[PDB]
TrEMBL record, chain A:
Subunit structure: Part of the 30S ribosomal subunit. Forms a tight heterodimer with protein bS6.
Protein name as catalogued: Small ribosomal subunit protein bS18
Family (UniProt): Belongs to the bacterial ribosomal protein bS18 family.
Keywords of this entry: Ribonucleoprotein, Ribosomal protein, RNA-binding, rRNA-binding
GO cellular component term of the entry, any: cytosolic small ribosomal subunit
Gene3D superfamilies to which the protein is assigned, alphabetical: Ribosomal protein S18
One Pfam family in the UniProt entry: Ribosomal_S18
NCBIfam families: S18
Lineage of the species this protein comes from: Bacteria, Pseudomonadati, Pseudomonadota, Gammaproteobacteria, Enterobacterales
Keyword Thylakoid included in the entry's annotation: no
Function comment: Binds as a heterodimer with protein bS6 to the central domain of the 16S rRNA, where it helps stabilize the platform of the 30S subunit.
Organism: Escherichia coli (strain UMEA 3162-1)
InterPro entries from the UniProt entry: Ribosomal_bS18, Ribosomal_bS18_CS, Ribosomal_bS18_sf
GO biological process, one term: translation
UniProtKB/TrEMBL annotation, chain E:
NCBIfam families: S21p (TIGR00030)
Listed name of the protein: Small ribosomal subunit protein bS21
One GO MF term attached to the UniProt entry: structural constituent of ribosome
HAMAP family to which the protein is assigned, alphabetical: Ribosomal_bS21
Organism: Escherichia coli (strain UMEA 3162-1)
Basic residues bias spans: 45-58
Basic and acidic residues composition-biased segments: 59-70
Name of the coding gene: rpsU
RNA sequence: CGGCCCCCUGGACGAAGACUGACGCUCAGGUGCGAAAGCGUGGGGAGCAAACAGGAUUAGAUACCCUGGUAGUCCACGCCGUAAACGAUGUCGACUUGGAGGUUGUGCCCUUGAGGCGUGGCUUCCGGAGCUAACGCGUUAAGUCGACCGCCUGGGGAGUAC
């Protein structure tokens, strides 16, 4: 039950923070493709986006850090 | 004798799901509707007719037919079919080596008969309650297993079967001895052991009944002849 | 890889029809150019072994093509090797 | 790479026989066609049919007697690795005469017996039984 | 697993919640994993072995299930 | 001939996949198993509990016709998913009928809110609606005679996940689950959910528009460990459950049943 | 009318808590001096019983073999497990030139004249089986004609 | 071969077309790449840790366990050329029943929805015929064949001596 297949997105955006936030943990970790049911191709992209965000301090690497 | 329309009504044309099929049944399959295999009634019917004819012929020379169906849905029906044409049957679990190991099973049959006699003709009664109970239980067991075949005497001259994959042991036994086999063979089943294959729905009750009935009729006809 | 425009140019020059592209000579030229390009890369990056494998393969292919040309038609081959400046 | 077409054809035929295939198709060649014809004559196949102009496909129609296959065995003898040429006296007898040996002679491809009759040997293509 | 006790929330409940959070995180498990160095080979082996086991559980057992026990 | 080919496309034309065409004739009844034949490869093992109406006893003898459902084929041997869901489509059609004249009228009787909306029951089935839907104003049916007779006037429906809150009394008055997972959230919002499969540690009740709930084994009852959830509740049944916990991240909404 | 030859008898053991339980295997083969052959492999705690069992086995599940006069119809290979066997038809007078288990099977079958080598393994049980297989596969001229859609004179 | 980014760069696959026209397959010698450890010169050195030291354990404990700990692991440029370098399965091509997946394209179809019907590439598991000493392999063969190469000929002595 993938979101990105239905939406039909060409590429996942690191700037689209809200969207990312659904796929990240309360502890900051990226959520598995088993749980979200994201398609494999998209999942990787999502992960990449998240990573990018983390570099730009848009998303946090973890809950504890400060 | 049996028409196509009737068969259709019954649900002969329906088969098993596509993932459970046997590719040796690819000739007898027509297509796949809703991911479920459809048996070709154009190829089935003539074969069925032929089988029926063969059965009739067998009957005519005073052949002993054995009706096998241990599905538990069509156990009641097969017995009925057998009894209509006063032939023999195995409606509960086929004992491994019933035919191949007849000589041992002949003893069992004899025992059963004896038990029956004791129960009925003796009219002695006066038996220890536990022992009596045990005896009764034994009788029940025997009846369930070998009730249809108690009057068979020797081996049957033909073997009618409701499911080939389910009764493969029986089929195998019939091949080892060389008894003609008349199996109803759904898409999941293997037709290679069967002599007179009948492509049709083993599972559906109405279809099974239909299959039985015609066969019974043919046997009766043969007997009459 | 070789840029599209460059490839096209190469095809036009060596190819008789210019739409042809698959002419032996044209192919050789294409290979040769690529090899030349990669020389620069490999001067810089001596440990890039994986990449160099591809280059080697290309070279081999070119050689094969040349050989083929030679048996078929000598004059053409000679011309080609004058144009490209292939010692053999 | 494809090195021996006749051999390949033979293999295909064998596989068809094994797997109870009605007809066996392959890319056509003149030699192959000849072989097929020979087989037909000798009665190991039902019929052969070449079809196409640019790249034609030979289609053999295999034979089955009493369930089992007709071509019991079919081996190449000559092969690209190691060629076999026999003189008319040295020509073999496959299955003590019951099978046939396809032999290519100066007067076309024929069965071994035929070759013998003619009075000429040649390259031994395949045994068929 | 950062948590804040809600207004008029019991202590025990809060504790339970915290525990749950921890479990979700898989923090303890992670710690256990990083206690000692696992050779790459060993890691690989476990993963594949585990996968195999899972597969066995899924399919073979399912096949068994089709047939009744008594 | 092509008699059979034409007959095949004919029989394709005169059946469909869902429980739509009321076709299976009940050809054997035995407690506790009904069985039909809707022109499928095999006969359904129907429960008796998809067919007793509103007080517990059976309603349909031999020959009677209800459609079932489909799109799932062969688990080993057999054919269907249950006809009772069939019924849901009919309910949906009646609810939809409202749209035409902007007023669906039956009877709705809603005594109380498990999760903030009185429960309304139509015919055999009972549904849960959001808190406003029960009353047109602030009237509140707590002062009304218990389990009172009105109809239902619809207040709110969730259109994906099936929750419908309907309007008792006042006759005169006339990606996708996981972003905004804050609706049934706040601590204990009770839900009505059908269980799906009980995995010997769990029960998997999951209804609210493409989510997954567990109610695993610890609550379920008021005994902890010896319980074995197959004994204690059901298979395929709409129950009392509420959230107790949502993680919108590792999609594990952990519902409960001891409440 | 049937002739029956016990090829081999072999003692085989089963280890148990106490020690070794011994038993005997008997490999026999029977034939009517014409096409019909059948081998039987019987097992029992005592030899004679085992032999009897083997004989019984043999007598059922026989097999027919097309024999051109006293000999085979063409050279035939037969394999089974380790034992791979070649046997070749031979002129009247030559006798059964064959070794061991193989010989016995031939004799009962009523082949009088063969040239037969057993390559590979010579484990009696396997080799007899191989021989049987070879015999079985061997087709006659008539049979071949039937197969091919021809007369016997066309094939020669 | 695993954070993220950029620059240079090799291969694979699909979609249609268009072109070249057997240019192919395999390969003794030859050439290159080739984990880890190891070597050389120059850097670096957190953690880990051969060696080493102490503390235990023990009959002993030149080990396992504990506390420390140096080469090394890291980088640059050279050398080494071996591993259960394994799928213990040479490369290339053709042919022979099926099922359940994964991954990555792509054509059509009302995408009426996460779908429906195909068609390509790579890939995991199960299993048929056949094959196999059996175990098992089974369209990714260990089946049926062809082309080329490599290699084996009882165990030890020995992959050692010269």
């Amino acid at each position: 039950f993938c979101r990105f297949t239905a939406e039909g997105v060409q590429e996942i955006d690191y700037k689209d923070i809200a969207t990312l936030k659904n796929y990240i943990t309360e502890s900051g970790k990226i959520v598995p493709s088993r749980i979200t049911g994201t398609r494999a191709k998209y999942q990787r992209q999502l992960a990449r986006a998240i990573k990018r965000a983390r570099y730009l301090s848009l998303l946090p690497y973890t809950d504890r850090h400060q | 004798t049996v028409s196509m329309r009737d068969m259709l009504k019954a649900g002969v044309h329906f088969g098993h799901q596509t993932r459970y099929w046997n590719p040796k049944m690819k000739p007898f399959i027509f297509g796949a509707r809703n991911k479920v295999h459809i048996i070709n009634l154009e190829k089935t019917v003539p074969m069925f007719n032929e089988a029926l004819a063969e059965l009739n012929k067998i009957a005519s020379r005073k052949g002993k037919i054995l009706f096998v169906g241990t599905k538990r849905a069509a156990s009641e029906a097969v017995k009925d079919a057998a009894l209509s044409c006063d032939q023999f049957f195995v409606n509960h679990r086929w004992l491994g080596g019933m035919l191949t190991n007849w000589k041992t099973v002949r003893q069992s049959i004899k025992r059963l008969k004896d038990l029956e006699t004791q129960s009925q003709d003796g009219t002695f009664d006066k038996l220890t309650k536990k022992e009596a109970l045990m005896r009764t239980r034994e009788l029940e067991k025997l009846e369930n297993s070998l009730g249809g075949i108690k009057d068979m005497g020797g081996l049957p001259d033909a073997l009618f079967v409701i499911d080939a994959d389910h009764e493969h042991i029986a089929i195998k036994e019939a091949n080892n001895l060389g008894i003609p086999v008349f199996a109803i063979v759904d898409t999941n089943s293997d037709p290679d052991g069967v002599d007179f294959v009948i492509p049709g729905n083993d599972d559906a009750i109405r279809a099974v009944t239909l299959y039985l009935g015609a066969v019974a009729a043919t046997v009766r006809e043969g007997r009459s002849q | 890889s070789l840029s599209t425009e460059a490839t096209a140019k190469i095809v036009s020059e060596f190819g008789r029809d210019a739409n042809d592209t698959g002419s032996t000579e044209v192919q050789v030229a294409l290979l040769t150019a690529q090899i030349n390009h990669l020389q620069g890369h490999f001067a810089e990056h001596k440990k890039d072994h994986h990449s160099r494998r591809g280059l080697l393969r290309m070279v081999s292919q070119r050689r094969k093509l040349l050989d083929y040309l030679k048996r078929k038609d000598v004059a053409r081959y000679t011309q080609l090797i004058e144009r490209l400046g292939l010692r053999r | 790479s494809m090195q021996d077409p006749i051999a390949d054809m033979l293999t295909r035929i064998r596989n068809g026989q094994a797997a109870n295939k009605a007809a066996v198709t392959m890319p056509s060649s003149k030699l192959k066609v000849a072989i097929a014809n020979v087989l037909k004559e000798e009665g190991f196949i039902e019929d052969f049919k070449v079809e196409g102009d640019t790249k034609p496909e030979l289609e053999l129609t295999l034979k089955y007697f009493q369930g089992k296959a007709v071509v019991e065995s079919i081996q190449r003898v000559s092969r690209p690795g190691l060629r076999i040429y026999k003189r008319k006296d040295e020509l073999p007898k496959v299955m003590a005469g019951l099978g046939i040996a396809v032999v290519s002679t100066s007067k076309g491809v024929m069965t071994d017996r035929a070759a013998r009759q003619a009075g000429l040997g040649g390259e031994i293509i395949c045994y068929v039984a | 697993p950062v948590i804040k006790v809600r207004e008029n929330e019991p202590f025990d409940v809060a504790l339970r919640r915290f525990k749950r959070s921890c479990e979700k995180a898989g923090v303890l498990a992670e710690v256990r994993r990083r206690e000692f160095y696992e050779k790459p080979t060993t890691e690989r082996k476990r993963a594949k072995a585990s996968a195999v086991k899972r597969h066995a559980k899924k399919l073979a057992r399912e096949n068994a299930r089709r047939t009744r026990l008594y | 001939e092509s008699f059979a080919q034409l007959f095949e496309e004919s029989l394709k034309e005169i059946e469909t996949r869902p429980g739509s065409i009321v076709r299976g004739v009940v050809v054997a009844i035995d407690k506790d198993v009904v069985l039909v034949d809707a022109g499928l490869k095999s006969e359904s093992a129907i429960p008796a509990e998809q067919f007793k109406n509103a007080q517990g006893e059976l309603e349909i003898q031999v020959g009677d016709e209800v459609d079932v459902a489909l799109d799932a084929v062969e688990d080993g041997f057999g054919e269907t998913l249950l006809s009772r869901e069939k019924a849901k489509r009919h309910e949906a059609w009646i609810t939809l009928e409202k749209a035409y004249e902007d007023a669906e009228t039956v009877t709705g009787v809603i005594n109380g809110k498990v999760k903030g909306g009185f429960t309304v029951e139509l015919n055999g089935i009972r549904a849960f609606l959001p808190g406003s839907l029960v009353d047109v104003r602030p009237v509140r049916d707590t002062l009304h005679l218990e389990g009172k007779e009105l109809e239902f006037k619809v207040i709110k429906l969730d259109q994906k996940r099936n929750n419908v809150v309907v309007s008792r009394r006042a006759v005169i008055e006339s990606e996708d689950p996981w972003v905004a997972i804050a609706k049934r959230y706040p601590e204990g919002t009770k839900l009505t959910g059908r269980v799906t499969n009980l995995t010997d540690y769990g029960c998997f009740v999951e209804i609210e528009e493409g989510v997954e709930g567990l109610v695993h084994v610890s609550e379920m009852d008021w005994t902890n460990k010896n319980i074995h959830p197959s004994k204690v509740v059901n298979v395929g049944d709409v129950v009392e459950v509420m959230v107790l916990d949502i993680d919108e991240e590792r999609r594990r909404i952990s519902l409960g049943l001891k409440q | 009318e049937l002739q029956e030859k016990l090829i081999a008898v072999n003692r085989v053991s089963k280890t148990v808590k106490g020690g070794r339980i011994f038993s005997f295997t008997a490999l026999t083969v029977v034939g009517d001096g014409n096409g019909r052959v059948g081998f039987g492999y019987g097992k029992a705690r005592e030899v004679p019983a085992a032999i009897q069992k083997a004989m019984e086995k043999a007598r059922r599940n026989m097999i027919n073999v097309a024999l051109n006069n006293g000999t085979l119809q063409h050279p035939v290979k037969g394999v089974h497990t380790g034992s791979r066997v070649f046997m070749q038809p031979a002129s009247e007078g030559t006798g059964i030139i064959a070794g061991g288990a193989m010989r016995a099977v031939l004799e009962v079958a009523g082949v009088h004249n063969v040239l037969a080598k057993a390559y590979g393994s010579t484990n009696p049980i396997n080799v007899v089986r191989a021989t049987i297989d070879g015999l079985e596969n061997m087709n006659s001229p008539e049979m071949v004609a039937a197969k091919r859609g021809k007369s016997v004179e066309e094939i020669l």
